Amino acid sequence: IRRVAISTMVQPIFSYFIMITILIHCIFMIMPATQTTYILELVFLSIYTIEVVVKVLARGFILHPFAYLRDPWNWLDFLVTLIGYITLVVLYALRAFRVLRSWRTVTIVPGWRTIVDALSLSITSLKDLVLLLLFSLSVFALIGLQLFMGNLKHKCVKHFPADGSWGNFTDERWFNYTSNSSHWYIPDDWIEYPLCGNSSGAGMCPPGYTCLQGYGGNPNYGYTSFDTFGWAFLSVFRLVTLDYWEDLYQLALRSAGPWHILFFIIVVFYGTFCFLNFILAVVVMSYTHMVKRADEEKVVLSPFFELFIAVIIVLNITFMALDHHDMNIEFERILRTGNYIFTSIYIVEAVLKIIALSPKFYFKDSWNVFDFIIVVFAILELGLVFRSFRLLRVFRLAKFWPTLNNFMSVMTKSYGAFVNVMYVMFLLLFIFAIIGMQLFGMNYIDNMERFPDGDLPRWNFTDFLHSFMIVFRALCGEWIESMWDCMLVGDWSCIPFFVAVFFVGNLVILNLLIALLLNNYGWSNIRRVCFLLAKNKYFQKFVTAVLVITSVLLALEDIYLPQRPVLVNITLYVDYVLTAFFVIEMIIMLFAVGFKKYFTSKWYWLDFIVVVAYLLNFVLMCAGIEALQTLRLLRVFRLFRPLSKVNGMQVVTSTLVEAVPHIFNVILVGIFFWLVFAIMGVQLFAGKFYKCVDENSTVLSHEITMDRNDCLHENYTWENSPMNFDHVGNAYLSLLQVATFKGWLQIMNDAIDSREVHKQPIRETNIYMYLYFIFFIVFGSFFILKLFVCILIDIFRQQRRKAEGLSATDSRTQLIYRRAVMRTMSAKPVKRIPKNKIQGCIFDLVTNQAFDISIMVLICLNMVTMMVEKEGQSQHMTEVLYWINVVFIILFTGECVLKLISLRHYYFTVGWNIFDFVVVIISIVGMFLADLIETYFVSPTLFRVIRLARIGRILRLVKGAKGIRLLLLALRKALRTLFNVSFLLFVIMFVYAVFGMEFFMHIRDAGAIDDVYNFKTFGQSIILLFQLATSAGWDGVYFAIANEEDCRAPDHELGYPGNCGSRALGIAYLVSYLIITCLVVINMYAAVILDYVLEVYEDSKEGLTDDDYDMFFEVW
Ligand SMILES: *[C@@H]1O[C@H](CO)[C@@H](O)[C@H](O[C@@H]2O[C@H](CO)[C@@H](O)[C@H](O[C@@H]3O[C@H](CO[C@@H]4O[C@H](CO)[C@@H](O)[C@H](O)[C@@H]4O)[C@@H](O)[C@H](O[C@@H]4O[C@H](CO)[C@@H](O)[C@H](O)[C@@H]4O)[C@@H]3O)[C@H]2NC(C)=O)[C@H]1NC(C)=O
Ligand SMILES: CN(C)[C@H]1CCCC[C@@H]1Nc1ccc(S(=O)(=O)Nc2nc3ccc(OCC4CCCC4)cc3s2)c(F)c1
Ligand SMILES: CC(C)CCC[C@@H](C)[C@H]1CC[C@H]2[C@@H]3CC=C4C[C@@H](OC(=O)CCC(=O)O)CC[C@]4(C)[C@H]3CC[C@]12C
Ligand SMILES: *[C@@H]1O[C@H](CO)[C@@H](O)[C@H](O)[C@H]1NC(C)=O
Ligand SMILES: *[C@@H]1O[C@H](CO)[C@@H](O)[C@H](O)[C@H]1NC(C)=O
Ligand SMILES: *[C@@H]1O[C@H](CO)[C@@H](O)[C@H](O)[C@H]1NC(C)=O
């Protein structure tokens, strides 16, 4: 018995047999069930049971150190087998998790142990971050609950008819009329009722309507609000993750007022730019530790011909990129003839090289094998669709292009780790797809009526392909809309599922991928006086002040300016004065530093360009020609030099300046790869996004209009999609929309509906086109776009080393030791006296640990009391809650009084004591103020705002938490640099705000631009640009500002400005903004955070921390 089992388990054939069985079982899990599946399930279960029996007979069960159930993997196997028997003999919710056995297949890929260990270490290291995350989210949920409670229910309700059609006024008849949903404003074909508010700057109502509270439901089937702590929690988590967050942001600003933008800024700054970067830092440290452990453990043959072939390759690529939809016949002939010529040249090259060199030596070269494969494919293509393989020719450019060559060699050097990570990602997606299919698939079929028109949504769980696509989309960062659908037809189980998918896929696996990338990709007197004046402090301060004031004046030139004559005059006068000022300043600087210094400096060149622009505008105005707006807007660029001199800014600007060349190289490589995908996209989809519509832009059925001829015979419209693959430029724009995941859903809907040209698309007739986008997303968004962060991280570390005056050649250990030696230099001990029988007794009672723990418990209880508040509660409940809060305030005041009585003046030697003392004083003053306000009823919003001080007494809960204290210390050390980065971001936003006001203030309402969100004033422009800095909603903004169709041109004689945008201008504006902010400046936060977190953690683990010195001086 025992001998057989012991020999059987160690035989490799046994392990391969089990693995192959698991693989076929997974395959059968993908396909639809049938009676044959039931018997195959029994076969698989028998095989797994035999494995369990063999291993128990070989090891024993638990009682010894090396028994069967001392290995976690065996725990997985055993629990899944038991679940299988349980579900076979006797809830279907348990039948899914047999797919968990597939996790074992991770052990097939060589080098799997490193990645699995890194994942395990990352998961175990998030312990303190989870607690801090939950606390922060709760605090923000409370703040949002008190600020936005009830706002998302606002609606425009028609006035009670004075005509008497609804009867004479009575309170009952008025309530009866206002509650009828047919009297609530909603534009035709809309799903959601628009929000409103009567505060200055909120959404307005049409005439005959008033903005009311308490009617109807909240947005998104009632799932989006701040009416309870739980929904507020959900909304805050959504906001931190940036998941469709522009919609909640616009809803709140439209119902509450633009000033509530402040709330969103705070949440985005703390939660997105700091905390998720803590998560990334933990993942990076874990991976670095594992890799450290692993590593420690241990004619034709001439340059001229090469150049000739290189230019021929470039010309062939150009010819390939020129292909487009509905080409004229001459264009087609030219391209075809060019193809013939290129193929002939490649054939000649192959033969010449094979004969000049030996055939044996010819096929010993990898590049030669690649070229021969290309020649074979080309000749096969011309002989006989093999055109898709023509793209291989593009990759020959890597032989001649050193940057691309190095990029390729780096990938070759470490392909194994990336293979492991991608396999883990896809295995996780497969497991979740199967689980979600079993849990939710039948809900969509059974409860289809609940959907807006009773139709199945594009994204569902009805079969394996759709389930995989929806979980993959969640991994890309979009989870909440799918969760709304799941809840609508399901129950609470949808919430944990999607959250888990998002957390594991996005915050762990993708972060691990970027960690891999980082690890791998990483007269004489006149000159005298002018010189003295130029170097003088006061003169520079005066110049800076003038620049700042006139730049602020630019922000006031909004759409209302023509109605304000005094402002018009002030701006004109300021323009004249600035012209004189710039000229005189240029002369002074020239006399100070001279011609050669002046004209070899980039700063002085910027100044000179501004001087020339203002002189040109002056000459134009003299001639009677209206000044160019762009030229006089160029003066804002003067702000950057004084900005670069702010305290602590030098590290940030040095990092960006040093990073520019690498960023450019990455952009070039990305353009190359995107060219490959764009040519493929044109080949697949060019000309196929046309469809037949009617007066309402509603797609007709193919059963009615089969093709273009039917469409036009019935006098319908054969309209193209604004985003398409008709030529390479449009393909590039569509691929940018895909990679950023902004507007990609419509593009993919068109792609999977596509049929041959001139035919009516059919829903999901070409579903497997999804594979195209998956590949692009893996190689364009997960790989190429994440290099920017790695570059910034690597460069910022070096620049900070420069700033602190540290040597570059020193090792990390030496710096750790120097840090400890610096700490020991500045530590000292403190003692306090225990007072006086009464005071001494109170001292003994207050200095004990029980007292502090009790204070913590009281804080937790007060926090729960705050969580009880909800929308619609009776006023009696409001009063009871306020009185309970009063009790808590009295208790904390008493704590402070006792501590003061005990410690006398020593009390203020501890910083936390000072914070608590300030909070107590503020609470007393606030109680007085609240009583006065509530009695005199100043304003409900004012009361809500001043109630924000209540959070002060809850923030003390972090006192004494060591793990949380470490991360807060890291954040404190980084605060200066984070602030400087934020300041730079805001200045860039200001520049873009004023140029956007100039370019787009008059455009018609379309897409995301409407009466509330637009470029009409500086504030509204900033509201839009803060949203756009995260790339959120930029597709709708582009659709608005790029529209050149169906518009009125300006009438200079009549003064009418016109109302439509510019495709080229909008493309330039938005693409440049996305690159500068989303891909560069925002990633600086991650760089800074990572450096500081790493420092503190290494101090904790391989050195000494301030707490070590504190403990040493506790004894002393
Ligand atoms: C600004 O923003 C506010 C929040 O978003 C919004 O409320 C406000 O809208 C409405 O503005 C008008 C002023 O033009 C204001 O009158 C509205 O409030 C009135 O509420 C009364 C409540 O009646 C109650 O009925 C219950 C029954 O259970 C009873 O118990 C209560 O004691 C109370 O009686 C309505 O009855 C009233 O309707 C008017 O009543 C007058 C009485 O004769 C009558 O002459 C009028 O013609 C009319 O019929 C109002 O609705 C206010 N909305 C709400 C919900 O209060 C918005 N705009 C302004 C201008 O404030
Ligand atoms: C019960 N009832 C009839 C009265 C009766 C007694 C007097 C008060 C009580 N009413 C009540 C109690 C608690 C909250 S409360 O639960 O919201 N707690 C809050 N704590 C703080 C703490 C400080 C603060 O202002 C500080 C700033 C004001 C200007 C500058 C400093 C405001 C708040 S409000 C509230 F709203 C109001
Ligand atoms: C230095 C860095 C780190 C922080 C920068 C400060 C911002 C938080 C400031 C700078 C400009 C401010 C904006 C200036 C103008 C406005 C318009 C204001 O609303 C109005 O225009 C009210 C009138 C109306 O809506 O009718 C709302 C506040 C807002 C967006 C301000 C909100 C706060 C902003 C973004
Ligand atoms: C108004 O009253 C009628 C009956 O008089 C009732 O059927 C209807 O539901 C009421 N509408 C409301 C309360 O919105
Ligand atoms: C709303 O008003 C319309 C028009 O009078 C009426 O037909 C409808 O029944 C009303 N709905 C309710 C719920 O009262
Ligand atoms: C367009 O929509 C409106 C509102 O549903 C409808 O009345 C009209 O008949 C529609 N037009 C066509 C051509 O279907």
Numbering used by the authors: 129 to 218, 223 to 430, 515 to 600, 608 to 745, 842 to 1154, 1157 to 1437
What does the paper say about this structure?
Voltage-gated sodium (NaV) channels initiate and propagate action potentials in excitable cells and play important roles in health and disease. NaV channels contain 24-transmembrane segments linked in four homologous domains (DI-DIV), where four peripheral voltage-sensor domains (VSD1-4) surround a central ion-conducting pore module that houses the ion selectivity filter and key ligand and toxin binding sites. The NaV1.7 channel is expressed predominantly in the peripheral nervous system, and genetic studies have identified compelling loss-of-function and gain-of-function phenotypes in human pain syndromes, prompting significant efforts to develop NaV1.7-selective inhibitors as potential novel analgesic drugs. Thus, we sought to exploit an engineered human VSD4-NaV1.7-NaVPas cockroach channel chimeric construct that had been previously shown to complex with small molecule inhibitors and peptide toxins known to target VSD4.
We hypothesized that the acylsulfonamide moiety of GNE-9296, which places the two aryl substituents 4.7 Å apart, might not be fully optimized for use in hybrid inhibitors. In comparison, an arylsulfonamide moiety would position these two groups at a distance of ~3.3 Å. On this basis, we designed N-benzothiazolyl sulfonamide GNE-1305 (compound 4), which demonstrated potent NaV1.7 inhibition (IC50 = 9nM, n = 8). Our last hypothesis was again validated with a cryo-EM co-structure of GNE-1305 bound to the VSD4 NaV1.7-NaVPas channel. Here, we observed the typical face-on pi-stacking orientation of the S2/S3 substituent with Y1537 while maintaining efficient space filling in the S3/S4 pocket. (E) FSC between two half datasets yields a global resolution estimate of approximately 2.2 Å resolution from the refinement using an overall mask of the VSD4-NaV1.7-NaVPas channel bound to GNE-1305 (compound 4) (F) Local resolution of maps. The quality and resolution of our structure allowed us to assign 111 water molecules for the highest resolution structure. In addition to offering valuable information for retrospective analysis of historical NaV1.7 VSD4 domain inhibitors, the structure of GDC-0310 inspired the development of a class of structurally differentiated inhibitors that trap a novel conformation of VSD4. These hybrid molecules bridge both the S2/S3 and S3/S4 helical gaps, with the anionic moiety situated centrally, interacting with the arginine gating charge network within the core of the domain. We have demonstrated that potent hybrid inhibitors can be designed with fewer membrane-associated elements than prior generation NaV1.7 inhibitors, and anticipate that this will offer opportunities to develop molecules with improved lipophilic ligand efficiency and/or differentiated pharmacokinetic profiles.
